[PDB]
Amino acid sequence: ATKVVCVLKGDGPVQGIINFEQKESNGPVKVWGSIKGLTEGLHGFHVHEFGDNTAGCTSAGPHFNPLSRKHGGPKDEERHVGDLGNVTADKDGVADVSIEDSVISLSGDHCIIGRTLVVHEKADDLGKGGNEESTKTGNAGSRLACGVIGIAQ
Amino acid sequence: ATKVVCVLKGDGPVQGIINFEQKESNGPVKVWGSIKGLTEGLHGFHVHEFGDNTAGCTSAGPHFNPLSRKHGGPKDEERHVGDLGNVTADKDGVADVSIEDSVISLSGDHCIIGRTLVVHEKADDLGKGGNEESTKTGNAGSRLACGVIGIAQ
Ligand SMILES: [Zn+2]
Ligand SMILES: [Zn+2]
């Protein structure tokens, strides 16, 4: 198996730890952990292209998109590789994350190791917002916290 | 050409940005940048195994050592893959870093992408201190700042 981890930090109070694990190459990736300090409700949750934190979350670049598609939800055929949809923060501002995704990988030429996981200010509209911003970012707004995706024990 | 970047942060005042670039998969890696907030003199400078910041720099684990060798300087035949030796901080606490290393790689089975770069409290004795600690860590002492090695534009 490949096991990786991401520590999410930003300019504000949002912080979290997200685990990724893949049992076999181009097999499904389990993504799980916890994020705290989020406003109650849905938050966009994406892998961005660059593991570059030189200008905070801004230098991570756009959603990881090596197949040059439009933004969508994780269940859509038309999506970015990095499109993991939303996570849900409870009334205490805690998002318990548990996702299974078959498009991201921890191996091969489109591997997300050394890229950036970002949790966003607002809900990802999954490309259903009726504008160019919807088909690029899902209107998920600002980057609250991010981390570079790193190899774990 | 693979280009990667590492933002070094820690508990205290030490911070920096280190770039890595490799033209070909066989080839040397250029390592360069700047670290500030250091004591004047030599500081151990190592790639550690895990890109895991869950318990700060401690969760990075030991020096990256896929060939199960003893600690050395970068020029020693016996070294860890992660053994990049010392960087030098000037009297203002700034280390200008410029290293070329042919043992680390930014691709292949022993890639350092998603691993951790650490700058240490004291000088690396390059595995020549005549104790067990020398053969593991070079007696470079505590981890002042670290970052996950990420993909850059
Ligand atoms: Zn997207
Ligand atoms: Zn070593």
Residue numbers in the entry:
A (entry chain C), B (entry chain A): 1 to 153
Show passages lifted from the paper.
SOD1 is a homodimeric copper-containing and zinc-containing enzyme, serving as one of the cellular protective mechanisms against reactive oxygen species. An alanine-to-valine mutation at amino acid position 4 within the SOD1 protein (A4V), accounting for 50% of SOD1-related gene mutations in the US, causes a rapid and aggressive form of fALS, thereby reducing survival time to less than 2 years. While the mechanism of dimer destabilisation and the increased propensity to aggregate remain elusive, several structural and molecular dynamics studies have demonstrated that the A4V mutation causes structural changes in neighbouring residues close to the dimer interface, which potentially perturb overall dimer stability even though the interface interactions are generally conserved in the crystal structure. On the other hand, several studies have shown that Cys111 could be a potential target for the development of compounds to stabilise SOD1.
Previously A4V has been crystallised in P212121 and P21 space groups that have provided insight into the destabilisation of the A4V dimer but in contrast to other mutants, no compound has ever been seen in A4V. To exclude the effect of differences imposed by crystal packing, the crystal structure of A4V SOD1 in C2 form was used to compare monomer-monomer orientation. All dimers in the asymmetric unit (ASU) of each structure were overlaid onto one dimer of the A4V SOD1 structure without ligands. The average RMSD of three dimers in the ASU of the A4V SOD1 structure is 0.19 Å. The major difference is in loop VI, residues 109–114, which is more open in the compound-bound A4V structures with some variations among structures and an asymmetry of this loop between two monomers. The result suggests that loop VI is slightly displaced upon ligand binding. Binding of the ligands to A4V SOD1 does not seem to affect hydrogen bonding and hydrophobic interactions between two monomers of the dimer or the distances between residues at the dimer interface except the distances between loop VI when comparing to the C2 A4V SOD1 structure. We note there is a structural variability across A4V SOD1 structures which is not eliminated by crystallisation and whether the subtle changes in the compound-bound A4V SOD1 structures are related to the dimer stability requires further investigation.
